[PDB]
Curated annotation (Swiss-Prot), chain A:
Coiled coil: none annotated. Keywords: Acetylation, Chromosome, Citrullination, DNA-binding, Hydroxylation, Isopeptide bond, Methylation, Nucleosome core, Nucleus, Phosphoprotein, Ubl conjugation. The modification N6-crotonyllysine is found at residues 26, 108-109. There is a cross-link at residues 3, 5, 109 (Glycyl lysine isopeptide (Lys-Gly) (interchain with G-Cter in ubiquitin)). The nucleosome is a histone octamer containing two molecules each of H2A, H2B, H3 and H4 assembled in one H3-H4 heterotetramer and two H2A-H2B heterodimers. The octamer wraps approximately 147 bp of DNA. Monoubiquitination of Lys-109 (H2AK119Ub) by RING1, TRIM37 and RNF2/RING2 complex gives a specific tag for epigenetic transcriptional repression and participates in X chromosome inactivation of female mammals. It is involved in the initiation of both imprinted and random X inactivation. Ubiquitinated H2A is enriched in inactive X chromosome chromatin. Ubiquitination of H2A functions downstream of methylation of 'Lys-27' of histone H3 (H3K27me). H2AK119Ub by RNF2/RING2 can also be induced by ultraviolet and may be involved in DNA repair. Glutamine methylation at Gln-94 (H2AQ104me) by FBL is specifically dedicated to polymerase I. It is present at 35S ribosomal DNA locus and impairs binding of the FACT complex. It comes from Homo sapiens. The chain holds residues 12 to 120 of 130 of the full protein. It is found in: Nucleus; Chromosome. This is Histone H2A type 1-C. The modification N6-succinyllysine is found at residue 85. The modification N6-(2-hydroxyisobutyryl)lysine is found at residues 26, 64-65, 85, 108. The modification N6-(beta-hydroxybutyryl)lysine is found at residues 3, 26, 85, 108. Belongs to the histone H2A family. The modification N5-methylglutamine is found at residue 94.
From Swiss-Prot, chain B:
It is linked to Tessadori-Bicknell-Van Haaften neurodevelopmental syndrome 1: An autosomal dominant disorder with onset in infancy, characterized by poor overall growth, microcephaly, hypotonia, profound global developmental delay, impaired intellectual development, poor or absent speech, and characteristic dysmorphic facial features, including hypertelorism and abnormal nose. Other variable neurologic and systemic features may also occur. Keywords: Acetylation, Chromosomal rearrangement, Chromosome, Citrullination, Disease variant, DNA-binding, Hydroxylation, Intellectual disability, Isopeptide bond, Methylation, Nucleosome core, Nucleus, Phosphoprotein, Ubl conjugation. One of its GO terms (cellular component) is CENP-A containing nucleosome. Changing residue 9 to T: In TEBIVANED3; results in early developmental defects when expressed in zebrafish embryos. Changing residue 15 to P: In TEBIVANED3; results in early developmental defects when expressed in zebrafish embryos. The chain holds residues 24 to 103 of 103 of the full protein. Transmembrane segments: none annotated. The modification N6-(2-hydroxyisobutyryl)lysine is found at residues 9, 22, 37, 55, 57, 69. This is Histone H4. The modification N6-acetyllysine is found at residues 9, 69. There is a cross-link at residue 69 (Glycyl lysine isopeptide (Lys-Gly) (interchain with G-Cter in ubiquitin)).
From Swiss-Prot, chain F:
It comes from Homo sapiens (Human). The chain holds residues 62 to 135 of 136 of the full protein. One of its GO terms (biological process) is gene expression. The modification N6,N6,N6-trimethyllysine is found at residue 19. GO terms for cellular component: extracellular exosome; extracellular region; membrane; nucleoplasm; nucleosome; nucleus; protein-containing complex. This is Histone H3.1. It is linked to Glioma: Gliomas are benign or malignant central nervous system neoplasms derived from glial cells. They comprise astrocytomas and glioblastoma multiforme that are derived from astrocytes, oligodendrogliomas derived from oligodendrocytes and ependymomas derived from ependymocytes. The mechanism through which mutations lead to tumorigenesis involves altered histones methylation with gain of global H3K27 methylation, altered Polycomb repressive complex 1 (PRC1) activity, aberrant epigenetic regulation of gene expression and impaired differentiation of mesenchimal progenitor cells. The modification N6-succinyllysine is found at residues 19, 62. The modification Phosphoserine is found at residue 26. The modification N6-acetyllysine is found at residues 19, 55, 62.
Swiss-Prot record, chain G:
The modification N6-glutaryllysine is found at residues 2, 11, 14, 76, 84, 88. The modification N6,N6-dimethyllysine is found at residue 25. The modification N6-crotonyllysine is found at residue 2. Belongs to the histone H2B family. The gene is H2BC4. The modification Dimethylated arginine is found at residue 47. Transmembrane segments: none annotated. The nucleosome is a histone octamer containing two molecules each of H2A, H2B, H3 and H4 assembled in one H3-H4 heterotetramer and two H2A-H2B heterodimers. The octamer wraps approximately 147 bp of DNA. Interacts with VRK1; the interaction is mediated by the nucleosome acidic patch, a cluster of negatively charged residues of H2A and H2B forming a cleft within the nucleosome core. This is Histone H2B type 1-C/E/F/G/I. The modification N6-(2-hydroxyisobutyryl)lysine is found at residues 2, 11, 14, 25, 53, 76, 84, 88. The chain holds residues 34 to 126 of 126 of the full protein. GO terms for cellular component: cytosol; extracellular exosome; extracellular space; nucleoplasm; nucleosome; nucleus. The modification N6-malonyllysine is found at residue 84.
Amino acid sequence: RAKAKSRSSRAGLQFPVGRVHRLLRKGNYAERVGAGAPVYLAAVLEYLTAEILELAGNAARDNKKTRIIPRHLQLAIRNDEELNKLLGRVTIAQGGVLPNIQAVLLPKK
Amino acid sequence: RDNIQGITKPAIRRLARRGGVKRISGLIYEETRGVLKVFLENVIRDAVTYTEHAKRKTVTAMDVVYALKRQGRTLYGFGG
Amino acid sequence: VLRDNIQGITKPAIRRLARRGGVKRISGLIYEETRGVLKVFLENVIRDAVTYTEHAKRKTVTAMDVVYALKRQ
Amino acid sequence: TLMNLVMQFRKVCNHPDLFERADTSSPFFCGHFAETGSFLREGTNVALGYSTRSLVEYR
Amino acid sequence: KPHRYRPGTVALREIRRYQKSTELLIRKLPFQRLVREIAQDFKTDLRFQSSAVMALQEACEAYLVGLFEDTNLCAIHAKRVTIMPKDIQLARRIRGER
Amino acid sequence: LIRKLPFQRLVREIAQDFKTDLRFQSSAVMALQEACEAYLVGLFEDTNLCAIHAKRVTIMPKDIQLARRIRGER
Amino acid sequence: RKESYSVYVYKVLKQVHPDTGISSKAMGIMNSFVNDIFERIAGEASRLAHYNKRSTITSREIQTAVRLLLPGELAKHAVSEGTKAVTKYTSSK
DNA sequence: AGTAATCCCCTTGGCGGTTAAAACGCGGGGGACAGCGCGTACGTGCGTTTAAGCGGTGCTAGAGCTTGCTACGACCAATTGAGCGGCCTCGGCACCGGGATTCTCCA
DNA sequence: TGGAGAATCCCGGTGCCGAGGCCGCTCAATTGGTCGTAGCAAGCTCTAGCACCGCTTAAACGCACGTACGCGCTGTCCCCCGCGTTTTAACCGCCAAGGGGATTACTCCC
């Protein structure tokens, strides 16, 4: 009985290939679940989590904050064209909005 | 009861400021109340439908999130 | 090879599509705007219809692949 | 069904109002009236019309 | 004579305050009662978790803020600075709610 | 409403950006055309409201752009 | 006993920004996001298997799902990350 | 095995106050809206030509279906440590105050 | 251009509560072997997709030219904004209740 090394560690991922395998089964998405399909998915979940948190860590830094807040997630997600297209029907709790004033509303000379 | 009038004029003003609106016709306030309750009457009947079908006599945050997600307005932060 | 076939949706065709949408009068700048609309639409439908075709390892795009692409809009 | 009845007997041994409470009462009323269908939708202000009507109904 | 900012100056100072903020803009207790009222029409003797009425408020406010943006663009599409009921009515018809 | 042959050629021309030497079933092109006509007709309806709302009987490019912006297409 | 992505999100946060924290409410957004995109991908992978008349969710199902659900450059980067993760799971066990 | 008392917990309801947010009044400004003149830009009709549409002929790519098996996932039992619930603390972020800088408006 | 003063910013100080790490343990992920089968592969069938020709005429284009309508301009007036006053109800805290769901007792019935 050999020493166990997690499917995540073998794949090289921080995200859990085990849970992604279970949840692909418990959700009854299909009758059979391949061995590598939880790995591919666990990698994409990890990748997109890095995209969000990279841009949000920049935005937190811009606000002189050490710590990410749903505000910084909203700012990151709306500023980036592709995250904004990926999340174009998602409401983020306590995100607020982008600062955006139509040019016609600004004061006259 | 009419707590729809508890959605005050200053509150409808504040929401329009966040929406970036400079000048607001006084007729807007009753239009906005009519629009708000039509939204709530769709989300709560679904949130009730979940608690009813899931056989509980209290409404949980996730009942709302399923209701919203099925309405098409995915909310992140309250489960989901 | 094919090029500029977006000018195959003629201005009378854009008139017919606008009149059936109830439009009375049409600014002469609409005709190029309509093409920038139709092409951006038809690209991202066909992008999926072809993705459903190279998945399942086939070479004709089928009406079902179109239907699955539209259903993704 | 004694698993029910021993308690139901014991209830009246203690006091009959536990079994079915005595209340303000009147003769059988042999007439039509409009009964309330919903308590919830009646609200706080309501008009009590005189609905009392005979079931013997000569046409 | 008192100092007085011109009409529309503080409307801009306010836009730059409610944008650039995260707070909920509807008072909490009034929204609870409106929610309970609407709930009674569907099932009486329901109850709500605190996080359920919060989730429901957050979704409402985000719906109204996002709606106002679309009416601001309708108002500004006509020559106007002022939003009117006909702008809400246009926005919701273009969206397909109406 | 759109002529069939120049719509076929538009479909082929677009598709070649994704995969060379695709084939299209005849029913697949008609399903694309019928969706495009229904899409353009349905957008012109929404632009006509944008013109009429601005008191203009004549639709203008900013009416397309307002319709799409509110539909969330942009 | 509930289950959360918080530990894995922290282990991504400390890679991209080893100095940076995250608040519980923001971690909430990350859980909802991972749940929502996991479910969106699995939903297309399900439909792709069903359309093909196949009983099996393979990595090929999840590849085609990722190329449907993501914008063009996120799609390609995700397809790259996914294809190497499976390649290193292969050549192991 | 059933039905009722006992007890936890968590939601709803009421009371008091305090103060911060909603309502109310009033001057004026400036933005909404009707009105006018022009002019240019879109709808109309005609003659032109262009190619979309139809009926018809020819080929081969490849969609679709069957056969055969073995590689890959479903299922189970034993092993263990990765991940969750509970407790702790200290440092990040807010909140305040005060003086410094900015912006706005009438002169 | 200046100025006055209000509104927005910044700098340092205070404190509180929640973020980040530690601890115990369970139970869910992993190791090992089994067995069924499905979908990967090789092979045949013939559908239907693509290519070309020739004809027809309806559909598309270029142009003349009139007038209907988009747009900048002018005037007004009304109604929505900025600010001081008045008042009410949202917020907070603390106590009550009730209800319901899980547990435990005791009898009758099988």
